[PDB]
């Protein structure tokens, strides 16, 4: 298992514009296009992202390219973030994957707000951090995926994804 396979499981793959769990226009492997309520605005963001007139449909290869770019940006965003970097640095390879997943889903700002859980993670208090992570809108809105990510942080294994 790896970050790519993990996120692919969590986000799925869709080749036509769709609405995410929050009602935002998305495509591919969890690539948010816009928070705007307009499909045209979404189609415009899509063409610009792909470099062509898509008509809201993309190919698998194009979905994967957006995916690669998004994972790279997530990692890069973590490394440039003063609140995130330290946590990330302190973790093992499996748990780092859990943190990238959260950043991929909620953005660097969102994650940077989990001040207390981050601290517990840096201290390596696995069970306590898991309880604290669960007390969030994040867990209440997408409980199954949140449970998978939490289990990953708790155990340091990929068991939740196997
Ligand atoms: Cl983009
Ligand atoms: Cl879920």
From Swiss-Prot:
Enzyme superclass (EC): hydrolase
Effect listed in the UniProt record for changing residue 26 to H: Facilitates transglycosylation more effectively than hydrolysis; covalently bound substrate
Statement: the UniProt record of this protein carries the keyword Acetylation: no
Gene Ontology BP annotations: cell wall macromolecule catabolic process; defense response to bacterium; peptidoglycan catabolic process; viral release from host cell by cytolysis
Record's GO cellular component terms: host cell cytoplasm
Stated induction or repression of this protein's expression: Expressed late in the viral replication.
Compartment list: Host cytoplasm
Consequence recorded when altering residue 11 to Q: Complete loss of activity
Active site feature: 11, 20
Phenotype when changing residue 11 to N: Loss of 84% of enzymatic activity
SUPFAM superfamilies documented for this protein: Lysozyme-like (SSF53955)
pH dependence: Optimum pH is 7.3.
Purpose: Endolysin with lysozyme activity that degrades host peptidoglycans and participates with the holin and spanin proteins in the sequential events which lead to the programmed host cell lysis releasing the mature viral particles. Once the holin has permeabilized the host cell membrane, the endolysin can reach the periplasm and break down the peptidoglycan layer.
Residues holding substrate: 32, 104, 117, 132
Enzyme Commission identifier(s): 3.2.1.17
Outcome reported for the amino acid change (mutating residue 26 to E): Complete loss of activity at neutral pH; covalently bound substrate
Main location group: host cell
UniProt record similarity statement: Belongs to the glycosyl hydrolase 24 family.
Protein species of origin: Enterobacteria phage T4 (Bacteriophage T4)
HAMAP family in the cross-refs: ENDOLYSIN_T4
Annotated phenotype, changing residue 117 to V: 50-fold decrease in enzymatic activity
Keywords: Antimicrobial, Bacteriolytic enzyme, Cytolysis, Glycosidase, Host cell lysis by virus, Host cytoplasm, Hydrolase, Viral release from host cell
Name under which the protein is recorded: Endolysin
Superkingdom of origin: Viruses
Parts forming coiled coils: none
Catalysed reaction, written as an equation: Hydrolysis of (1->4)-beta-linkages between N-acetylmuramic acid and N-acetyl-D-glucosamine residues in a peptidoglycan and between N-acetyl-D-glucosamine residues in chitodextrins
